[PDB]
Amino acid sequence: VESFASMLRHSPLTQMGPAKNKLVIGQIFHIVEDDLYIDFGGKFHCVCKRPEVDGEKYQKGTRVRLRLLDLELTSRFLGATTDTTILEADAVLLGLQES
């Protein structure tokens, strides 16, 4: 039986380190007419805009590539006890699964 510290040591998210400038492949699970809701698998879905090139082949279940900056967008404003999560992630589109 494996201990949980061993699983944290060998999890891919621990191997990620910094959340800035990381190339992560993700999967689109919901289609809004200009908005792509992409579950890259970490914690939250990110929202991207449909690009002007090859915009027809971004559908449900499509795998894309992302460059992560913040895994969860969250900030403090004055007069707030707790931070303000947006319940999203920040990532931009590079392309879709070049194979």
Binding site: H30, V32, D34, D35, Y37, V47, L73, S75, F77, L78, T84, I86, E88
Partner: protein, 86 residues
């Protein structure tokens, strides 16, 4: 007075219109803050009034820049919601 003339606070017109150069000059004085300086130096303000005005301006600037930061943070959530009638 002792300085060289016509170098400072001077703009030149382009292609024969002067109103555009005038709004350019007014933007220069506006970002440099000289316009409010001439408005506030028409009369004399006491140092107590000066301190109150600076405190009010600093408080308003802090609140406005932090509120604009919150608007810029929440601007990406203005999209149409995907889960209507869930």
């Amino acid at each position: 007075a002792n300085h060289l003339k016509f170098i400072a606070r001077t703009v030149m017109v382009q292609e024969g219109n002067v109103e555009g150069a005038y709004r350019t000059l007014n933007r220069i004085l506006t970002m440099d803050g000289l316009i409010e300086d001439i408005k506030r130096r028409r009369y004399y303000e006491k140092p107590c009034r000066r301190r109150q005005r600076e405190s009010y301006e600093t408080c308003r600037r802090i609140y406005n820049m932090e509120m604009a930061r919150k608007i810029n943070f929440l601007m990406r959530k203005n999209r149409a919601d995907p889960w209507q009638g869930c």
